[PDB]
Design a protein around this nucleic acid. Structure first.
Ligand code: K
Length: 335
DNA sequence: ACTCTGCCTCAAGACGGT
DNA sequence: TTGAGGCAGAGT
DNA sequence: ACCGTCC
């Protein structure tokens, strides 16, 4: 994430966002952040406050979500490649650790809810306690393998590896809600791509070059701006938000300069501010080699699919086999 | 009055059958 | 996790 | 569209 970046671009660079109907992404490949979508499902796919599961106790909401949305996308001519998060950059420790503490917090607030009724709390805190695990990951990779859908492991940050794939032309765009993908230099970002039957929000397409033009910056100044707005990798200056940050970056072009010209009594900066290191992470992140693996959208293995989902995970053979045929079908073509 | 902060709420997908 | 949106209040 | 259920 980059705090407020979406609203900012809407506000001061509206020409950088197009809204298109899904019909116009027909025949395009997109890169998807696996870990974020798995998360979205673990949160949303709930039956009675609880997550879907086979009786052995193993979770399955993520498998549901992934299987079906993937199929939908494929039907609409959208070939998705899933990129899985690698090892988090050191600069991320801070953010990550906060995320642990809050979870611990939630967990305590779980007990005091359970021992006092009102499942409103129980389910709220339970949602706040959601966490993607290496198991979730391994399972989804298996599923995608048996669906013929290609997946890649990012050495570190998935978003950075997505931006790398779009840069290299291996895909048209990155489909994610994480504005940071632009910071890492991805020329095109697509929010709200679900290929879902109930629509909801219109697909949003962000062009990086348009953002740059409309804001009057180059990529480097744009990274600095995102750092000021609020990145996952270092702190921000208290009291400088979107409006002020745009002003300052437009006037002084860099963080060093900005820090020289700032009144240290009105706007004091953070102590031991790793902003230069963050910046360098954004310009030169560790990413996979987009030329190593040639992405192929294979044919589903229907039998093995039934064995895995239906067999191991108690999925209705009819719903599954139906999905498998919609997908095998969409491979040869169609609507 | 503009801006930011921080504390809060609240919600989070897809399908099949009407 | 991400919003959007709500509000009080401090600080300009 | 609504909504009961998917597991
Ligand atoms: K800030």
């Amino acid at each position: 994430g980059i705090q407020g970046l979406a609203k900012l671009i809407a506000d001061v660079a509206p020409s950088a966002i197009r809204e298109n109907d899904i019909k116009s992404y027909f025949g395009r490949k997109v890169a998807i952040d696996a870990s974020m979508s798995i998360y979205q499902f673990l949160i949303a796919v709930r039956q009675g406050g609880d997550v879907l599961q086979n009786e052995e106790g193993e979770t399955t909401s993520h498998l549901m979500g992934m299987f079906y949305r993937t199929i939908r996308m494929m039907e609409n001519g959208i070939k998705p490649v899933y990129v899985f998060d690698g090892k988090p950059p050191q600069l991320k420790s801070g953010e990550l650790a906060k995320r642990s503490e809050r979870r611990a917090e939630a967990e305590k607030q779980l007990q005091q809810a359970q021992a006092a009724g009102a499942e409103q709390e129980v389910e709220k805190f339970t949602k706040r306690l959601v966490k993607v695990t290496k198991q979730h990951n391994d399972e989804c990779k298996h599923l995608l393998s048996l669906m013929g859908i290609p997946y890649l492991d990012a050495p570190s940050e998935a978003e950075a590896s997505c931006a790398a794939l779009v840069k290299a032309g291996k895909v048209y765009a990155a489909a994610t809600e994480d504005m940071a993908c632009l910071t890492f230099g991805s020329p095109v970002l697509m929010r709200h791509l679900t290929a879902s039957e109930a629509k909801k929000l219109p697909i949003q397409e962000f062009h990086l070059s348009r953002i740059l033009q409309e804001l009057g910056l180059n990529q480097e100044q744009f990274v600095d701006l995102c750092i000021l707005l609020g990145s996952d990798y270092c702190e921000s200056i208290r009291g400088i938000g979107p409006k002020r940050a745009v002003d300052l970056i437009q006037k002084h072009k860099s963080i060093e300069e900005i820090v020289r010209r700032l009144d240290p009594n009105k706007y004091p900066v953070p102590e031991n501010w790793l902003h230069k290191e963050a910046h360098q992470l954004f310009l030169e992140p560790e990413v996979l080699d987009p030329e190593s693996v040639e992405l192929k959208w294979s044919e589903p293995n229907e039998e093995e699919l039934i064995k895995f989902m239906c067999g191991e995970k108690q999925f209705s053979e009819e719903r599954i086999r139906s999905g498998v045929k919609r997908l095998s079908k969409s491979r040869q073509g169609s609507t």
